[PDB]
Amino acid sequence: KKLSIYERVALFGVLGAALIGAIAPKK
């Protein structure tokens, strides 16, 4: 889910990157 600086930066950029544009684009 989220660690700090060894998982949260890879879990949000790999799972959160493809989630904010083709899922719930609140732009």
Backbone as CSV, one residue per row, in Angstrom:
resi,resn,N_x,N_y,N_z,CA_x,CA_y,CA_z,C_x,C_y,C_z
1,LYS,0.827,-1.201,0.000,0.000,0.000,0.000,0.866,1.257,0.000
2,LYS,1.691,1.400,1.030,2.575,2.555,1.148,3.581,2.357,2.277
3,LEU,4.852,2.605,1.980,5.912,2.455,2.972,6.468,3.815,3.384
4,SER,7.242,4.427,2.492,7.836,5.730,2.763,8.646,6.218,1.566
5,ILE,9.813,5.616,1.364,10.681,5.987,0.254,11.317,4.755,-0.383
6,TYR,10.579,3.651,-0.385,11.069,2.406,-0.964,9.910,1.498,-1.366
7,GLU,8.762,2.106,-1.647,7.577,1.353,-2.044,6.430,2.293,-2.404
8,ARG,6.335,3.403,-1.680,5.283,4.384,-1.921,5.564,5.184,-3.190
9,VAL,6.832,5.222,-3.590,7.234,5.950,-4.787,7.136,5.068,-6.027
10,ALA,7.053,3.760,-5.811,6.951,2.808,-6.910,5.540,2.239,-7.014
11,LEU,4.802,2.294,-5.911,3.436,1.783,-5.878,2.444,2.853,-6.321
12,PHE,2.841,4.114,-6.185,1.988,5.231,-6.572,2.272,5.662,-8.008
13,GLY,3.492,5.396,-8.468,3.871,5.764,-9.820,3.565,4.671,-10.825
14,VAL,3.349,3.457,-10.329,3.047,2.322,-11.192,1.580,1.922,-11.080
15,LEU,0.985,2.195,-9.923,-0.416,1.863,-9.687,-1.269,3.125,-9.618
16,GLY,-0.641,4.240,-9.257,-1.358,5.498,-9.161,-1.259,6.320,-10.431
17,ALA,-0.319,5.955,-11.298,-0.123,6.665,-12.556,-1.177,6.264,-13.582
18,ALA,-1.508,4.977,-13.611,-2.504,4.465,-14.545,-3.891,4.446,-13.913
19,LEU,-4.051,5.191,-12.825,-5.329,5.260,-12.125,-5.899,6.674,-12.171
20,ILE,-5.044,7.642,-12.482,-5.464,9.036,-12.563,-5.433,9.537,-14.002
21,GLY,-6.292,8.965,-14.841,-6.348,9.368,-16.234,-7.263,8.482,-17.057
22,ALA,-7.386,7.222,-16.651,-8.235,6.272,-17.358,-9.193,5.572,-16.399
23,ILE,-9.385,6.165,-15.225,-10.276,5.598,-14.221,-11.217,6.658,-13.659
24,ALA,-10.645,7.649,-12.981,-11.433,8.726,-12.396,-10.765,10.079,-12.622
25,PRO,-10.724,10.515,-13.889,-10.116,11.795,-14.267,-10.928,12.989,-13.778
26,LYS,-10.558,13.514,-12.615,-11.251,14.660,-12.036,-10.579,15.966,-12.448
27,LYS,-10.233,16.070,-13.727,-9.586,17.268,-14.250,-10.614,18.225,-14.845
